[PDB]
Design an enzyme around this catalytic site. Structure first.
Site, PDB file in Angstrom:
ATOM      1  CB  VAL D  48      -0.776  -0.047   1.214  1.00  0.00           C
ATOM      2  CG1 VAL D  48      -1.820   1.048   1.186  1.00  0.00           C
ATOM      3  CG2 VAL D  48      -1.835  -1.121   1.145  1.00  0.00           C
ATOM      4  CB  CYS D  49       4.071   1.907   1.892  1.00  0.00           C
ATOM      5  SG  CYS D  49       3.669   0.982   3.276  1.00  0.00           S
ATOM      6  N   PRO D  50       3.772   2.330  -1.413  1.00  0.00           N
ATOM      7  CG  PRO D  50       4.065   0.634  -2.866  1.00  0.00           C
ATOM      8  CD  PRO D  50       4.130   0.951  -1.453  1.00  0.00           C
TER       9      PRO D  50
END
Ligand SMILES: [Ca+2]
Ligand SMILES: [Ca+2]
Ligand SMILES: [Ca+2]
Ligand SMILES: [Ca+2]
Ligand SMILES: [Ca+2]
Ligand SMILES: [Ca+2]
Ligand SMILES: [Ca+2]
Lengths: 203, 209, 208, 211, 210, 211, 208, 211, 211
Positions: D48-50
């Protein structure tokens, strides 16, 4: 301190009952049997205190009808109490006072009931004596009403009788007592409908 | 705690005065100028509380004549107070109550005056848990012009108070302030007071005989 | 407070449910049965709070279809709540709000959930500011675990859309084991939580 | 921690700004000049972070026009950040993310902002053990030009955030700051706000019954 | 802290083994079976660390023949480790490193082994402030098959370690375990050791005079 | 104890320098002038310890050329040290050892450097109990001209140390000090070091792979 | 510290007995069987210490006849002791010293007997600094067959002790144990002792 | 307590000097002027104690010639001391003892010098209980002219002390002060001492060996 | 120490009884059998103390008639006591004193009875220094057959006590024990006591107002 809704603190002390010194006086005896009006005063052989004690003696029958025991208390010894009930009223005495007068000789009762004056090596500011304190205790030993007056302001038997009447009315009918309520006047149902109906009738 | 003979604790809170929300209300304004009758009640929009508030409004002239400011207080918000004074009395409201009604929104006033109900605890990891409700009992205080508490009274929730008893205590305090005479049991204004001395109490008690 | 991944603190207080004062209201009843959207507001009879309460009322069906119970809470008494739901909306009231509105009369609920404003200092105990709740919102799953929280300053109203979106993302992750990327909405493409999953998801963004 | 109405905790750490490692990055520079949207994510090179970082990069103009600086943060080193911005997006990288990415290598920033996961314990002999991972949850803070936090949001690991909601909260804060009107539920820029008064709320709520 | 003669602290963390992320990696698996060379380095994607990791990969057979498991560790996440082993060496990567690289993501392992840099202090508001970076120094430990630390070494950040010295210490430990002879200064496998006695030391030192 | 990056703890003790007992020996004298290789051994008149001491004597010129003072230390008295340097090597002695041998007679130096063996307890009657022997393990420290520890090594009792590794670490420290290049794994004087940058490590690793 | 009338503290350490290093040496072995003359000296390879150790070796028969075991002790290692007994006396060594010489390598024995020199100062964090040397002064203890200390003496570093005084105190202790007579000032074996009573002391003093 | 090398603790008490009770007696008066032999005994009117006191009286000239002041001490009162010096020796008295006899009536002196018998303990009842008798053992201290304790000896109650040993230790201390030579085992005044050096001890032991 | 109404503190000490030193003397022996008059004095061989001890000896029969054991106590040793009872009175001695004289050699009895003079204070060196003398003031206690203190008296050093007052308080205690009548001010055996009641005190004082 706040005792409303809490059990009246237990004690066991010497007292003068019917003018006679008796030991191990406690409010235990009244639990389940009588309401208690317990009042503290500062000093034997003073000024407002004898009038309050004598007046409670004069109204004693009115409290008897209501299942109410009257109990006085100060931090003087039981022997000062005894000397005082053996002093005629025209000499400042409280002769004829027959209900229990408790001797709080260690000041622990006045401390436990939150009416002890003064402020506390150990030094003390002021005098460790009781203010004019009054407590209404129900038959379960629970405090339902309390009042404390400064030294020069005597109390009122009428207000004590009124609060007794209000407590007994609420216990009997579950109706809460509005401002200024007296026996025979309209009480109130504790509900939205109750408050709307009571306040509409006043206007 | 025991406030008799001690200064009434200071506070500064929102209030409804003359039906309007105002900030920074305090009893400081009355020091040196007016006596104060300060009374706490538990909850807005209830049963005994509106009768006490309305009755104090009706008796406001008796306190005005004696230089006494009437102040109500509960731990409800100032907006709950405002909605309550804008509710007609026949619906349980307190319309027309014009003296200050203080909002003890942080409950610190009720704590400082010793009328806050409930009991607090700290559990194993339970932080602050409370038994009962942290609301004010029916507490009443007479504060003189120096800010000193001279009389206090606390009733359980179902026991409404009496304006006559408050007026009588006001009269007793003012009489003692003026004449130095102590007020005996059942005293009312116009009745015989007492000189605080051996002879004074002896003579007073002789007159009753 | 940090409650994500931890149980929502237990409470038991008076509330107004369907406009009637009821005692002993708790979120226990919803464990294993419904998700909970629990939101705190500062004061009855104010300004943003009625719009949020009414809006949650209007969208109540959108939460019902998702097995979500809506519960509001402030530090006002249950009688203040009862008076407020009996005030018509054109006068600032919240008439018709039927979901539970909890009374945090002791302020312990707001404290335990980390949304209580004000500062407590001892000298007695003095308080800077007002001990009232900020605009706090929590999503609690069927196991009673906090999965999302949001707190807004007093003048900043919240959004029903973001609450529904976070609910949809939680339920999607529960159902499919797919993590929800930035800006995901129900019906859009999620992601498999793996090296291949993120590489494939990001590659498609550069292909379309 | 409850930061609403309180200053955003100070920090000074290494970061990757415009793809380059720089020291002593702090939010001090923005006081009196820019709002800050500060967001924490748990791990470099994950899932999810990217998407969140890339989405903030692509929406960067929408924040620039609103005088908002976007700052990301995780507890990975600045070199993990640098390697990640040099990894192409089709392989999971965040190439082209140019706003500051803070390295909270000591985990003190995440702890101060109340977003650090995990549980810390001490042993029978005094050792320090940790249950779970001391990494940041999906935390987001709106900081006004005075450095005060006005909005905060934290999501569990698999629940990505929303740029639309961040922009909306910025618009609501700026509207209240400019006009003194409070923003009701679901408010967006250009819609009717509300005057914070008895009459104001009565007027707002009556109009909703017709429109 | 001093670990010589004491058990190597237990841990259980994510790691990259043979280029794949695996959970619950521990040195327990090696007790009674293999020696362990455990080495900490400060940061993924830096300078001396890739050379040390790659060199350990190239020398892996020398440790395998000696029943020695090689384990690397830093406070970076397991995903940084994974990204690093998937970066080619000509770009600073550590591709081809196949032994376990532990992720000390909570920094508890580095603390327990006494190699964590930086200084921690609690301010009067409760929070903990830190001077410097809480990353691992270039620490190396030899752990015997009983789990006891027999050799430790810590280097400052710019000073890479030496595979030869690690192998020499392993050989010395195994020689002492086998023959009960203590290993003198500069000893290597195949050279004369020493009997730990008055006569033993007198005899060893006498032979060195020619 | 972790001493890397920290000052080598100060001490002042009796020592044997050039076979003579001298008081108030301290490493202060070397600050700003020489590096220090400080090594601890457990007991005078034992087995590995004389071989290490004699070997350091044989390599003394190699350390002199590098501005490194060699200092040995044990918790034996200065008189045991002096007697030992007056015992011929063929009898187990360390005759001919001329560099300073410090007497850590109070065990405070070994404690401060984290090389003291043994375990202490408080007994039933508040007594002080000690498990094992309070003697020094085979500890070695590299101290730069500022008095800061740059390298430390501790061996169990039966594992003698290596002069080659000490000299190699000295050369690496001096190379980094002179050229600012970090020294990779297995580096020796005359081999290629490395620039501490992205490009530096990329260039160094490329040259190895086809070599 | 005061050990008179109290048990000699227990220990168990390496020692050199008859020139050989032995482990687990303790004074337990002598309980119920032998008296102990236990003496501490500061440093191996010094000046007064070898003369004291050699003299105790030469007078060993006088202690043997009196059922007294002689034990020396310093905080030097057992290997330092062994090297010293293998050094000829004409070079300052203690060759031929055959009674046990204890190694107080941890300094705990010297501390427990109250003969350890030096001063220890401790700070908040616990860093221990020492003024002077933690070595033993010239301490001597007479221990009876029950392990009870009956006589103790401590001398500064340059003041050697006396074999005659130790033997004399042994004789006094044994005389009191055997006959119940107390030993007056300057008493030697064969001289007149004293009955511990009013008449006893009056009669003894009258004869002088 | 260990007093060797430390100042003799200060005190100021009543005493009997030349048979007369005097106040404020202290050893300060001797600092810089005389050595001090201070001896403690347990009880006035007992058995070994009168023989020790009387014998010290008889040897008083030998200590005078050596610049040594003799001082006795017990925890008895000064009036018990005075009664005892007025009791004839043939009745167990110490008539004729003329040097100062200190009254340690508070037991603080015996405590400070580490010669007080008994054990003190506090209960849960807060009271102070004592095991044994708080009286002085047969303790003896040699104090140099600077007030530093150089020799101490404590005997159990039934073991009388020796005037010869006190004289010998005095002679050894004075010899070391004058000549810097340390006194070997069994040394007496006039016998061969030793130079504190390697050569000194090597030479001394050689003369004992052949001769 | 307020001991009125509380048990007399227990002790067990050496004493001189009938001129002979005896061990383990305690007031336990008198419980249920005899009253105790316990008196403390400061120092053997002084001035007021012999007059008090001798006077108690002369009045011993008056206490025997009343079932009262007389016990003296000081912090002097049992041997000082023994010497003092063997000194003729014309020389200041207490020859012929035959009742128990307890030796409070540890000062614990005097401390427990609240009669110990002096001031104790702890030095910064943890040491205990004493201001004044730890000796007993002229303390006197009447202890009943149950071991309960019923009367106490303490005099400064120069103020001797009175046998008459001790006998009088003994008579008053015994009168109250036998007849339950309280003893008024100045009561002596044979005079009118008082019934402890309202009528009792009124009647007692009525007779006095005539006489
Ligand atoms: Ca009290
Ligand atoms: Ca509060
Ligand atoms: Ca609270
Ligand atoms: Ca932390
Ligand atoms: Ca130490
Ligand atoms: Ca003492
Ligand atoms: Ca005492």
């Amino acid at each position: 301190m706040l005792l409303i809704g809490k059990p009246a603190p237990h004690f066991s002390a010497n007292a003068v009952v019917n003018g006679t010194i008796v030991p191990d006086f406690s409010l235990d005896q009244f639990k389940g049997k009588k309401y208690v009006i317990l009042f503290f005063y500062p000093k034997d052989f003073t000024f407002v205190c004898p009038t309050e004690l004598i007046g409670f003696q004069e109204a004693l029958g009115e409290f008897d009808k209501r299942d109410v025991a009257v109990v006085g208390c100060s931090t003087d010894s039981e022997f000062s109490h005894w000397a005082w009930v053996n002093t005629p009223r025209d000499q400042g005495g409280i002769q004829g006072v027959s209900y229990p007068i408790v001797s709080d000789i260690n000041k622990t009762i006045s401390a436990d009931y939150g009416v002890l004056a003064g402020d506390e090596n150990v030094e003390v500011n002021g005098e460790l004596i009781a203010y004019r304190g009054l407590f209404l205790i129900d038959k379960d030993g629970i405090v339902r009403h309390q009042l404390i007056n400064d030294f020069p302001l005597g109390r009122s038997i009428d207000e004590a009788i009124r609060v007794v009447d209000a407590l007994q009315h609420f216990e009997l009918y579950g109706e809460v007592c509005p401002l200024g309520w007296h026996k025979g006047e309209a009480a109130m149902t504790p509900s939205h409908e109750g408050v709307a109906s009571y306040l509409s009738k006043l206007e």
